[PDB]
UniProtKB/Swiss-Prot annotation:
Function in brief: Hydrolyzes phosphodiester bonds in RNA, poly- and oligoribonucleotides resulting in 3'-nucleoside monophosphates via 2',3'-cyclophosphate intermediates.
Entry's Gene Ontology molecular function annotations: RNA binding; RNA endonuclease activity
Protein name as it appears in the record: Ribonuclease
Lineage: Bacteria, Bacillati, Bacillota, Bacilli, Bacillales
Family to which the UniProt record says this protein belongs: Belongs to the ribonuclease N1/T1 family.
Location in or out of the cell: Secreted
Impact reported for H100Q: Loss of activity
Organism of this sequence: Bacillus amyloliquefaciens (Bacillus velezensis)
Active site (UniProt): E71 (proton acceptor), H100 (proton donor)
Keywords annotated in UniProt: Endonuclease, Genetically modified food, Hydrolase, Nuclease, Secreted, Signal
E.C. code: 3.1.27.-
Enzyme class: hydrolase
GO cellular component annotations of the record: extracellular region
Amino acid sequence: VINTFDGVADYLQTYHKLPDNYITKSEAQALGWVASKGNLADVAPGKSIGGDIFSNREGKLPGKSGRTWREADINYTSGFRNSDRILYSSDWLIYKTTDHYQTFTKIR
């Protein structure tokens, strides 16, 4: 599975989509994921949460007209979700956060 910062980042700028081991929160819930039980690995073996829109409410990521942000979980294997996320834009800027969206740094 591809779920590292560098692996997913180089996958996106290239194929312009997430690798196939990713599903959105919606898909996950429908399959039986209950966040409070940390059961993702049991109901969707080998998948990670990713692809949902990221608001960028706190305006910490650079905006521009027509630019939308999306997020994906990084380094996930099982249990409860961790605090690592990749943030990617419609024009393919890539940022990372390891502190639950508090701070961000550019990686592509």
